[PDB]
Amino acid sequence: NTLTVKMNDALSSGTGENIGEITVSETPYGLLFTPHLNGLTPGIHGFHVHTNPSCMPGMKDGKEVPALMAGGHLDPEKTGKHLGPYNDKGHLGDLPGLVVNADGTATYPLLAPRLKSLSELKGHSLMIHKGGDNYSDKPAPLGGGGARFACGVI
Amino acid sequence: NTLTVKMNDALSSGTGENIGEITVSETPYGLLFTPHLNGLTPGIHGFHVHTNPSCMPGMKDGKEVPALMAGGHLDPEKTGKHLGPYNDKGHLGDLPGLVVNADGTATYPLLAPRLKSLSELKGHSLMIHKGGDNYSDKPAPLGGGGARFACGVIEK
Ligand SMILES: [Cu+2]
Ligand SMILES: [Cu+2]
Ligand SMILES: [Zn+2]
Ligand SMILES: [Zn+2]
């Protein structure tokens, strides 16, 4: 009745350390992402479903990009807007920001009400960014998440 | 449309200093609680709607309990169960844990999908607890929230 997603650090070199898992469950109000992660910087981290089932690095615009092969934020409706987990006008893959505790662990459960079934996650990937997520494309694109820190294929 | 709740520290004496405000807005997926608070301990704090519109202290077992007049967790369905914001079998007033950043501010928005209209908060109070919230009555009752750190009555 649940999915367990192993998350690993993303380097320009390839894949890095395993930093734990995220357990995805179904609730009457949407999918609940319960992290069991370690080794993250305290604070709020951008957290999204990406289109492709890969965490491999790649080259873009002559720049090394960790976990580039995951593609962009999951966007089956082709909205082209990053508007967060509570706005149906943006990427379906926009999840609530990941909450990292003072000791670098992540445990606080995150409800994504726009996702209703675990079947919607199959063939995709989960991404944790270095920066946060203000659920907007301003003042920074894609909520300000920036580089990809960790990634896991579903 | 939107509601703004001023929050004040709750003490044996009475009402303490203001710690900021919580802005409640309506979304198609439920009420969104956006805090703007300062001066809390970093970590996750139990965060619940309480039944009665008061933050005044009261006496219980030979002691002045902070914000006791607020009553318990809002529970119109008389479940008597603390099961958190995603479980319809427990207190309706169970909100997601309040996230306090490392610097002691609270800013992360909290969606309570079981609450649909701001009118459901009228005549009640918001409470922030010292402890966290595991959305269960085990191992500790009421999610482990413990004492009442801050409180605010829902006005307008
Ligand atoms: Cu992302
Ligand atoms: Cu409470
Ligand atoms: Zn997005
Ligand atoms: Zn409760």
Side-chain angles (χ1 to χ4, degrees):
Chain A
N1 46 354
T2 69
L3 290 165
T4 306
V5 181
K6 286 253 281 143
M7 301 295 290
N8 309 295
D9 286 347
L11 320 163
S12 301
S13 314
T15 307
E17 295 182 25
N18 177 257
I19 59 161
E21 319 78 33
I22 298 171
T23 299
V24 192
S25 65
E26 295 179 349
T27 83
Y29 295 97
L31 295 188
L32 187 67
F33 294 76
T34 300
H36 179 249
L37 308 169
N38 65 86
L40 297 123
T41 59
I44 305 303
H45 290 257
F47 181 44
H48 324 104
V49 186
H50 286 238
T51 303
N52 300 326
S54 171
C55 293
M56 292 295 208
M59 301 277 227
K60 170 179 194 178
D61 313 308
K63 315 186 150 213
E64 318 181 276
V65 179
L68 178 72
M69 290 306 97
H73 297 189
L74 177 60
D75 196 13
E77 307 287 20
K78 314 191 175 292
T79 68
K81 305 163 170 229
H82 180 79
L83 289 166
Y86 316 131
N87 194 332
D88 63 359
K89 290 191 204 339
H91 313 131
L92 181 63
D94 290 350
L95 310 177
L98 178 88
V99 174
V100 178
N101 305 316
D103 65 1
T105 62
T107 52
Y108 181 82
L110 312 166
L111 180 79
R114 298 169 58 201
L115 302 167
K116 308 302 197 180
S117 162
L118 298 171
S119 66
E120 303 178 71
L121 293 183
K122 295 293 172 132
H124 305 303
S125 51
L126 297 187
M127 196 76 69
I128 295 163
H129 293 256
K130 290 190 175 156
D133 194 345
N134 78 338
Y135 307 149
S136 178
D137 281 310
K138 323 180 63 155
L142 304 178
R148 293 155 198 210
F149 172 78
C151 182
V153 179
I154 297 126
Chain B
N1 176 243
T2 191
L3 200 143
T4 295
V5 184
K6 305 171 281 292
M7 303 293 294
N8 294 275
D9 290 327
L11 355 152
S12 51
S13 173
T15 293
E17 287 148 22
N18 179 255
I19 60 163
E21 60 187 29
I22 301 176
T23 300
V24 197
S25 59
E26 290 175 356
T27 83
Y29 299 96
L31 297 192
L32 189 68
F33 293 78
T34 302
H36 304 275
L37 314 170
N38 195 69
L40 295 94
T41 67
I44 308 306
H45 291 255
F47 181 45
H48 324 107
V49 188
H50 285 239
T51 305
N52 289 329
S54 174
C55 298
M56 286 291 298
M59 201 286 306
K60 204 262 201 213
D61 299 338
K63 186 64 192 292
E64 291 305 310
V65 181
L68 193 83
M69 296 299 310
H73 294 190
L74 176 61
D75 191 15
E77 311 289 310
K78 298 299 264 152
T79 68
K81 285 172 190 243
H82 182 79
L83 289 169
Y86 316 128
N87 191 331
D88 289 342
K89 294 183 174 73
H91 309 138
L92 184 62
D94 288 353
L95 312 179
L98 176 86
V99 177
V100 179
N101 309 316
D103 67 0
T105 62
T107 55
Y108 183 80
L110 313 167
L111 180 75
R114 297 170 60 202
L115 300 168
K116 305 299 184 178
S117 174
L118 298 173
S119 67
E120 306 187 58
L121 298 172
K122 304 321 171 39
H124 305 301
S125 49
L126 292 185
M127 198 77 63
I128 299 169
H129 293 258
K130 270 174 125 174
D133 198 346
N134 77 337
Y135 306 152
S136 180
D137 279 313
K138 305 302 200 64
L142 304 183
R148 315 183 169 187
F149 171 78
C151 182
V153 183
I154 287 138
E155 301 305 19
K156 318 195 114 168

